[PDB]
Structures are given as structure tokens and as C-alpha cells.
């Protein structure tokens, strides 16, 4: 069933902390919980071991990533910048 309408994972907080704070943390809490892609085996096994650590349940590779995502947007653009810049460096 639809147990709750829109608080979602932030329903455990009940009525406290204010609905805006609960909404702001809901979008981060779904992210730090959902299983993610694994760049090394292509499985939905990845889970946040710790704040910034993303272990794969299989193949035991852990990646340092964002505290609430396997790879944040600034990290993604840094990896793009490094790839592009090494591309000009090499050729």
C-alpha cells in the first residue's frame, strides 16, 4: 500500500523538525540509501559504508564518493575536466 503520501523516508521523524527541514533532508536521505551502480561489476550492490565511502557488496571495491551520493556533481565535472585536460596534454 501507500503507507505515507509524501514524507517518505522522513516519516520516522514524526511531526518534529519542521516540514521544510524534513523535505530538505528527504532528498538527501533517499540518495544515501538507494543502491547504486557499481563501476566495476555493473550491479546494484553499492551502499554507503560511511560518510564518503561507497562499498560494493560484491567484488569488495569501495569508492570514495560524496557523503550522500556515489559521485557528486562537482566530482563529476572534475573528472570530466581531468579527462579533457589530459586529453589535450596527451594529444
Amino acid at each position: 500500500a501507500k503507507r505515507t503520501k509524501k514524507v517518505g523516508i522522513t516519516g520516522k521523524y514524526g511531526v518534529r523538525y519542521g516540514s521544510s527541514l524534513r523535505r530538505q533532508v528527504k532528498k538527501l536521505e533517499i540518495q544515501q540509501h538507494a543502491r547504486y551502480d557499481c563501476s566495476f561489476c555493473g550491479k546494484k550492490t553499492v551502499k554507503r559504508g560511511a560518510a564518503g565511502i561507497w562499498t560494493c557488496s560484491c567484488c569488495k571495491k569501495t569508492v570514495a564518493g560524496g557523503a550522500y551520493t556515489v559521485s557528486t556533481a562537482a566530482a563529476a565535472t572534475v573528472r570530466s575536466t581531468i579527462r579533457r585536460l589530459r586529453e589535450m596534454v596527451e594529444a
Binding site: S39, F40, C41, G42, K43, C59
Partner: protein
């Protein structure tokens, strides 16, 4: 333009999926082409390349992960490596790709 050539084989030709079946065929000498996904571990891909050098067979490197390889072959699981024992009427054996 590799997925349709693969689709011809998966319907008509003969094939095996997975590392164990791939090396089994490579040591039997039946395999003529092996396709390795990029997602597969480097150790596996390197030893498969070495087996292919020993067996004088050609290796195709997939332009995608094992998920892409699985979908392209047509099996809804992940396939790291695919071996093509007897291709059908597909021209991939006479094709460099």
C-alpha cells in the same frame, strides 16, 4: 553496428556465455571469436586475451559494460564475455570487427 551482427549469431549461430564456458571453449579450440565487455575485471580480460593469443583467435572489445553486452546478446543478465563457437550466416568471422 555490432549489435545487429551479434543478433544474427544469437539466433542462427552457436555461442556460449560467461568466463567459464569461454575458457572451456578456448582450451578446446572451438571458439573463433570472443567479445569482452569493458566492465569486466582487468585480470579476467587480460587472461582471456592471453588465451586468445595462445589459440590464435581474435578478440573484440565491447564498447560498453557487461550490462550492454548482456542486452546486446539478448539475455537479461550480465555477460562479461561471450564466445562464438559456430557463427551463423553472420560475416563477423570474415570481418575484422
Amino acid at each position: 553496428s555490432i549489435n545487429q551482427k551479434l543478433a544474427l549469431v544469437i539466433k542462427s549461430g552457436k555461442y556460449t556465455l560467461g568466463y567459464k564456458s569461454t575458457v572451456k571453449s578456448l582450451r578446446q579450440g572451438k571458439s573463433k571469436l570472443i567479445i569482452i565487455a569493458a566492465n569486466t575485471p582487468v585480470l579476467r580480460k587480460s587472461e582471456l586475451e592471453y588465451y586468445a593469443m595462445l589459440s590464435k583467435t581474435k578478440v573484440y572489445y565491447f564498447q560498453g559494460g557487461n550490462n550492454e553486452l548482456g542486452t546486446a546478446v539478448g539475455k537479461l543478465f550480465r555477460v562479461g564475455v561471450v564466445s562464438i563457437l559456430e557463427a551463423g550466416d553472420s560475416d563477423i568471422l570474415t570481418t575484422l570487427a
